[PDB]
Amino acid sequence: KVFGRCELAAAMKRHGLDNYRGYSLGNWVCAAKFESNFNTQATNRNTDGSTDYGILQINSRWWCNDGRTPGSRNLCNIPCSALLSSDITASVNCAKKIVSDGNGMNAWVAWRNRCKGTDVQAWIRGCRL
Ligand SMILES: OC[C@H]1O[C@@](CO)(O[C@H]2O[C@H](CO)[C@@H](O)[C@H](O)[C@H]2O)[C@@H](O)[C@@H]1O
């Protein structure tokens, strides 16, 4: 499913992401936009053999199991495929653990390079939340 900007903001808000660990909703929407273009079915393989899954591009080396990333952990205890569902619940709960890991949202490369330090509030402007 390819979410609409406001549609996703509302979904994330309902799942308790707004202000989660101090990160305003705009940050999460901005991260999703540049990580997957709001597409829950996005997948991208990295040089190390791991693969990123879903709307927030959760990595298989540490957060989920895809059965093909040897020596990897499954910190979120979920099959990576679960992160490609139209229901973002799985992705959200896993993202909550990732952002509490220590480096915050810096874990998401696109957020660090394209959202961090910008007017992220613009990502939810005009939306009915
Ligand atoms: O804990 C994940 C850790 O790995 C890095 C790369 O070193 O990012 C990977 O995981 C992210 C979250 O799942 C992906 O968005 C990213 O594309 C992937 O390389 C670090 O940025 C992050 O701290």
**What is the CATH classification number for the domain harbouring 67?**
1.10.530.10
Q: Return the ligand 1 atom nearest residue 44 CA.
A: 17
Q: Is 103 in the pocket of ligand 1 (CB under 6 A)?
A: yes
Task: Describe the crossing of helices 5-14 and 25-36 by its angle, rounded to 10 degrees.
Answer: 130
Six-digit token string for 32: 């999703």
Atom of ligand 1 nearest to the CA of 112: 21
- Number of domains observed in the structure of the chain: 1
Which tokens go with 55?
Answer: 């709307």
37 lines ligand 1 (CB under 6 A): no
Say if CB 46 and CB 59 are below 8 A apart: yes
Both tokens of residue 100? 């509490």
Q: After which residues is the chain broken (C to N over 2.5 A)?
A: none
Amino acid at 97: K
Domain region containing 18: 1-129
Taking alpha carbons only, the member of 26, 28, 33 closest to residue 126 is 26
Q: From 37, 43, 99, 108, give the residue whose CB has the most ligand 1 atoms within 8 Å, as the site to mutate.
A: 108
DSSP code per residue over 54-93? TTTTEETTTT-B-S-STT---TT-SBGGGGGSSS-HHHHH
Q: Is the CB of 129 under 6 A from ligand 1?
A: no
| Cα dihedral sign, 103-24-39-125 | negative
Place of tokens 């549609």: 7
Beta-bridge partner residues of 58? 53
Resolution to one decimal, Å? 1.9
CA distances from 28 to 17, 60, 66 (A): 8, 20, 24
